[PDB]
Amino acid sequence: DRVAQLTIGNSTITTQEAANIIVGYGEWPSYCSDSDATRPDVSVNRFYTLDTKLWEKSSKGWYWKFPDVLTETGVFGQNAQFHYLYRSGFCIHVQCNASKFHQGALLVAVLPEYVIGTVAGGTGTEDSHPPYKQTQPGADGFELQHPYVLDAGIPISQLTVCPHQWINLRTNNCATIIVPYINALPFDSALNHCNFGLLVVPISPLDYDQGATPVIPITITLAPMCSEFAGLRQAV
Amino acid sequence: HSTAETTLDSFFSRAGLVGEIDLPLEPNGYANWDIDITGYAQMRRKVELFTYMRFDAEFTFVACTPTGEVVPQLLQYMFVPPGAPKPDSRESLAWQTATNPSVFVKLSDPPAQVSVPFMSPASAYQWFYDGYPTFGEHKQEKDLEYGACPNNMMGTFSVRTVGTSKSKYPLVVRIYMRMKHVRAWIPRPMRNQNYLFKANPNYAGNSIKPTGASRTAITTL
Amino acid sequence: GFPTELKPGTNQFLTTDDGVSAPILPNFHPTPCIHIPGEVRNLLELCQVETILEVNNVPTNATSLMERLRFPVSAQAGKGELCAVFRADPGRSGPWQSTLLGQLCGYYTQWSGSLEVTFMFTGSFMATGKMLIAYTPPGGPLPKDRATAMLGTHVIWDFGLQSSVTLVIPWISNTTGLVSIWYQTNYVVPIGAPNTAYIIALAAAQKNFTMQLCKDASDILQT
Amino acid sequence: GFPTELKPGTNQFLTTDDGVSAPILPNFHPTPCIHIPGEVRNLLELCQVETILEVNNVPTNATSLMERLRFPVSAQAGKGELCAVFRADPGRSGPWQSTLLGQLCGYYTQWSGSLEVTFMFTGSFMATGKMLIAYTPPGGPLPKDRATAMLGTHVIWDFGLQSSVTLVIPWISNTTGLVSIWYQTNYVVPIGAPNTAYIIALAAAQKNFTMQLCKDASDILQT
Amino acid sequence: ATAMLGTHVIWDFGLQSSVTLVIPWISNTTGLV
Numbered sequence: 023d024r025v026a027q028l029t030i031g032n033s034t035i036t037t038q039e040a041a042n043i044i045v046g047y048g049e050w051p052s053y054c055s056d057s058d059a060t061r062p063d064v065s066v067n068r069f070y071t072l073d074t075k076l077w078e079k080s081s082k083g084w085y086w087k088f089p090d091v092l093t094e095t096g097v098f099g100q101n102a103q104f105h106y107l108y109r110s111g112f113c114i115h116v117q118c119n120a121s122k123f124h125q126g127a128l129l130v131a132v133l134p135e136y137v138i139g140t141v142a143g144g145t146g147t148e149d150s151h152p153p154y155k156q157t158q159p160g161a162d163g164f165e166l167q168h169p170y171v172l173d174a175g176i177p178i179s180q181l182t183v184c185p186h187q188w189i190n191l192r193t194n195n196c197a198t199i200i201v202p203y204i205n206a207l208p209f210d211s212a213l214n215h216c217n218f219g220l221l222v223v224p225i226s227p228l229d230y231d232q233g234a235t236p237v238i239p240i241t242i243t244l245a246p247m248c249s250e251f252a253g254l255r256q257a258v
Numbered sequence: 259h260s261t262a263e264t265t266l267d268s269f270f271s272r273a274g275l276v277g278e279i280d281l282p283l284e285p286n287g288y289a290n291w292d293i294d295i296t297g298y299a300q301m302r303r304k305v306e307l308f309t310y311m312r313f314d315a316e317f318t319f320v321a322c323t324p325t326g327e328v329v330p331q332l333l334q335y336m337f338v339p340p341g342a343p344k345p346d347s348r349e350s351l352a353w354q355t356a357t358n359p360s361v362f363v364k365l366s367d368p369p370a371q372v373s374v375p376f377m378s379p380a381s382a383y384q385w386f387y388d389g390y391p392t393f394g395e396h397k398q399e400k401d402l403e404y405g406a407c408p409n410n411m412m413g414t415f416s417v418r419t420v421g422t423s424k425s426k427y428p429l430v431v432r433i434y435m436r437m438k439h440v441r442a443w444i445p446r447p448m449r450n451q452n453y454l455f456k457a458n459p460n461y462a463g464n465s466i467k468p469t470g471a472s473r474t475a476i477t478t479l
Numbered sequence: 480g481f482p483t484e485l486k487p488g489t490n491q492f493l494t495t496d497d498g499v500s501a502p503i504l505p506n507f508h509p510t511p512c513i514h515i516p517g518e519v520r521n522l523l524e525l526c527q528v529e530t531i532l533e534v535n536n537v538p539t540n541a542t543s544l545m546e547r548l549r550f551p552v553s554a555q556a557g558k559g560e561l562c563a564v565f566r567a568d569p570g571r572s573g574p575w576q577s578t579l580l581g582q583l584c585g586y587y588t589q590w591s592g593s594l595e596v597t598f599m600f601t602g603s604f605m606a607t608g609k610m611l612i613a614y615t616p617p618g619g620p621l622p623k624d625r626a627t628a629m630l631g632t633h634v635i636w637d638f639g640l641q642s643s644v645t646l647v648i649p650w651i652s653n654t655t656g657l658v659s660i661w662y663q664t665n666y667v668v669p670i671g672a673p674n675t676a677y678i679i680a681l682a683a684a685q686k687n688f689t690m691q692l693c694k695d696a697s698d699i700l701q702t
Numbered sequence: 703g704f705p706t707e708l709k710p711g712t713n714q715f716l717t718t719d720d721g722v723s724a725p726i727l728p729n730f731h732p733t734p735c736i737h738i739p740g741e742v743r744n745l746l747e748l749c750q751v752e753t754i755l756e757v758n759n760v761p762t763n764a765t766s767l768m769e770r771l772r773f774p775v776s777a778q779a780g781k782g783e784l785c786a787v788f789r790a791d792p793g794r795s796g797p798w799q800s801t802l803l804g805q806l807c808g809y810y811t812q813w814s815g816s817l818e819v820t821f822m823f824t825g826s827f828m829a830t831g832k833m834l835i836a837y838t839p840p841g842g843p844l845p846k847d848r849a850t851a852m853l854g855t856h857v858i859w860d861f862g863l864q865s866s867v868t869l870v871i872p873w874i875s876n877t878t879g880l881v882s883i884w885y886q887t888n889y890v891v892p893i894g895a896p897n898t899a900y901i902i903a904l905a906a907a908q909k910n911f912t913m914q915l916c917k918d919a920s921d922i923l924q925t
Numbered sequence: 926a927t928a929m930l931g932t933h934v935i936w937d938f939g940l941q942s943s944v945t946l947v948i949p950w951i952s953n954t955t956g957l958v
Contacts, residue, residue: 026940034934036941049516057910058873059511059814071929087388095926106841119939122604123671127679134444134517135309135386137405141463142454149455151401157388161926168463170544171451175461177469179531179548179577180447182681192604193642202516204444206310206380206409211841215389225531225548226601226677234671243935253872255842256850263587263691264522272693273494296700303698304586310515316500318492318710337503341811342917357918359503362715368490371711373502379812379876379914381513393841393877434494444517445525448582453700468547470576472536476550476563479621482704489708498709501719508914 033069035243037117037196045187046200051111051248054208060105060251065097067245069115072161074239077118079228083166085221086242087136088112088201089212090158098246104257108212109203110249114220116197118189120238126228128240129178130197131186134204136219138173158216169223178223190226200247209252270437273318274298277433279417287348287424290338291415291433296456298435303449305385306459308442312382317415318371319363320432328365329427334418335361335370340377340411348421358416373438374412382443383410386459406457526580526684529597533577534565534680548577550678552602552610554666559625562610567594567648567656578682585696592688594648596658600638602676605669607639611661612646617654625661635663647685749803749907752820756800757788757903770800773901775825777889782848785833790817790840790871790879801905808919815911817871819881823861825899830862832887835869838880848884858886870908 023040053061070092075084089110093102102108116130140152156164166173172181187197204217222240230236262268276297279289296302305311319335322328338344338358345352352358363370387407395403415433419425450469451461473479519525535547550563565574570590575581584590598612613628615621622628636644646658668674742748756770773786788797793813798804807813821835834848836856845851859867869881891897936944948956 024940026937032932033929036935036937036944038940047516069935071933071935073926096930104842106839119937123669125601125603125606125673125676127599127601135384135388137386137388137459139458139460142460143464150460151404151458153401157404168466168541170541170547171461171466174459175449175451175453176447177450177577179450179469179533180579180582182530183445183447183525183528183579188599190599190601190642192600192602204516206378206382206384206515208513211392211394213841214392214394215387217388219388225545225679229673229676231671231673241935253839254854255839256845256854259689260691261521261523261689263693264689266520266522269522269586269693271497299700300695300698302700304695308519312512318500320492339504339811339915339917341915355918356717357916360717363713367713368708368710369492370714371492371500372716373500375502375504375507376509377507379510381510382515434492436494441512442519443515445519447579449698453698466541466544468533468536468538468544470533470573470581472538473574474536476534476536476565477561479564479566483706484703486705486707490710490712491707492710496709500709500711501714501716503716504718504916505720506916 030245031065031068033071033245035069035071035115037115041194041196042187044198044200045185047185047202049202050200051202053248053250054109056208058208060254062101062249062251066249067247069243069245070096070098072242072244074241075163076237077224077228077240079236081165081224081228083169083221083223084163085136085159085166085219086161086163087157087159087216087219090216091161091163091244092246093212095161098249101251101254102212103255105251105254106211107209107252108250109205109209111203111247112201113245113247114197114199114201115243115245116187116189116199116222116240117243118191118195118238118240120191120195121234122191123234124191124228124230124238125226126191126224127226128189129181129186129223129225130189130199130220131181131184131223132199132201132218132220133172133181133184134218136174136216136221139175140173141167166221166223172221172223178225181223203248209250266440266442267438270301270304270313270440273316273434273436274301275432276435277415277431279431279433281417281419281425281429281431283425283428287419287421288345289417290344291417293412293414294456295435302453307446307448308444309386309446310382310384310443311440312376312442313437313440314373314375315435315437316371316373318369318434318436319361320369320434321365321429322432323428324430329429330364330366331425331427331429332362332364332420333431334420335363335372336416336418337361337372337374338414338416340413342413344414345416348418352416353418377412378409380409382441386446405459522583522690523684523688525583526688527686528579529681529683530578530580532565532596532680532682533574534563536574548679550660550680551675552666552678553675554668555674558662558665560662562660562662564621564657564659567658568651571655575682580682580684584690586694587690588692588694589653590688590690591652593650593685594688595683595685596646596648597681597683598636598644598646599679599681600642600676601679602638603669603672606672606676607637607667609635609637609664611663612636612644613659613661614646614648615657615659617656620654621657621659625663628659628661745806746907746911749806749911750909751802752818752904752906753801753803755819755903755905756797757786759797771902772824773883773903774898775889775901776898777891778897780888781885783885785883785885787844787880787882790837790881791874792817793876794878798905803905803907807913809917810913811915811917812876813911813913814875816873816908817911818906818908819869819871820904820906821859821867821869822902822904823865823899824902825861826892826895828892829890829895829899830860831889832858832860834884834886835859835867836882836884837869837871838882840877840879843877844880845882848886851882851884
């Protein structure tokens, strides 16, 4: 509803809060004060704005995996290789921009512990396991193949049990999710245990008549919250 | 009004058939049962409804002949905790190690039952560990240490007949397991496609099928 | 020497008894209960969740399989004709089998309670038109036309004004009710709007929903 | 006639239950508990004890076996080169297996806690020099050179002033941590001082050390 | 991706049309926009 001017650290977004505003798990991200059985504020809390992936009429979906998405990109990415222990929350803010003459709802939803699986086949083989470049896709993300089962035998039909936000260009063109630290251990390696994996799945496909730019972008902007690290390693 | 049936402890606390151990006459004279909450081939689906879970469990052992015939033999059930060695063979020191608890029952005696506490270093079990365990192994060829978190290994069960001289009666040991004090956490959507492997959620991409039944058109019944 | 006589039922093994049995390791202190977000203590907490209601049923073959979550809504053929109808019982197989609710009810037998059905329109911001959603109780069949459907409990639904309409299924317990969706109006498509748009249907249970009897369903598992 | 039913699991013999059983000699008063110094009531009170840390590993053959408790420190070659390194996990085999900590951990499985490692210098009173002791957390390898070692958590250790330096290891739980000792400086040896001096390393567990699961290791016993 | 790291402003059209960028300090390569 007109105007938008939001700035932190160095980054700067321009959104708004005129429709649905915020979805959390029911719990804001926080710290810990026990026996465990560094807290950067003046650099990490800046809006990392990812790369706008396109969206054709015949797309199938995309999914990033936290915290891999940033671990090799950004000041945050740096102090993750050098540190070994990790803990944080997240302020995911997905924003797509398109005309009123378009249509096609999206489902922004976060699925914690997104263990994936590929198809057995190819040559006549029975067993196979997904490569590193599908479990840890990085900033660019990864175009999934089989939406209906989330490449995991997991029906999308019930995905909304997990934190979710609808993006319907009729009503809303913006999404904001707040994700807390979710683990069986209060700290884990950020490198080899990618927690929740964000995924964006289109149900109502994008449509338009003749001649109307068939490609509307999806600007994904996210920012860490209550990040926490402990011991660190040596530099190159 | 009654909502206890929809509670977790009412949803899992049922003794299911988990382990079927064959002790024939003429396999090697012992058996090791790696504890896996599957076996009861549906709890699998019922468990991956959640991601993080935690529970204590009671095991119960019903032993008989394939006949169902009852024979005066004296068995030894042994719990082998995680990390601890498994019995290499029939007379290895693993029966005497005493760290690994042991249960000595006859069959004339009623079924032996024992409780087992929650045995993970982590705060809870995981049915999904998207990533690789501490710590990361390189050197290629490898693509096997994935989605497997050994922190959820509950130990193993071993049985004798007992030694030293061989038994006379062919025996089967029916293994029953029931959960207690269950606490689950963040909820997963339930499986829709057939399982393929244990400890891995792969699926048959060649043959994807709809979640539920289907009709010819929407406007008909 | 406290005298006892063994009441029958001794030595029995019951797969459901809530007995406490001897512990393998009395001197073992488990990893302490830490706090983890999203703790669930009862399955009802899932039944209150908006889940997708597979109404469209066509697996031809798997590429179009994702078209099971959507409705077809176009200008053609036009006014008044029936858009879509579906059953009103989760236990039944099973356009409801998409929901977590349907699946969860598949692990039970007896039901009771109200249901919410939330529809979301996914067309342009410009396209308008109104549609009629009518609920039909168990007794009595699908009303042949809107005129007859209007008489029953119904909801006149517009696009242009609001995009999200929630239908409250009043009550269910044990034909088992019917819900019919009607083209009350034409489908208006300004100029560049697509003549055909799609609808997603969301379903969930009311706070008074209950199940009663445990039972296990059908899954497969090979070597 | 007190009704009782034998809950299943009767007559079983379990190697760990703490049940109370009949006494052989009911009328017997054992020799009374007198006071004996150095009573131990928990094994943790032993893990808090500084014991000798076998770092040097050379059994050539049994004569030089005592050279396992000592470090080599000489003048040549000099600065920057690595002196000695060792693992940071008692359970692993096993320069720690010398410690009381190391052996006790062989009688358990899961560990958790911080550790103190105290180094003691054994050179002349006149001889000085400084060395760098740096701890490296699990992830990440042996730091390549002192320059890389300084950046991490490290302790500049001098001789001439003090002889006992304590290193605080923050955390261990189940690459597995590393402790590196570096020739930051040369080794000064006035005139009659030996060109080569030796170091003793002492280790012990911090007060927050805990074990959790019993397990037994390897011993043999003949007639 | 590399450009984002420096001081930057994500600018939308549809919502706002005028966005001002503040060059912090200049005095005597010499800064860039």
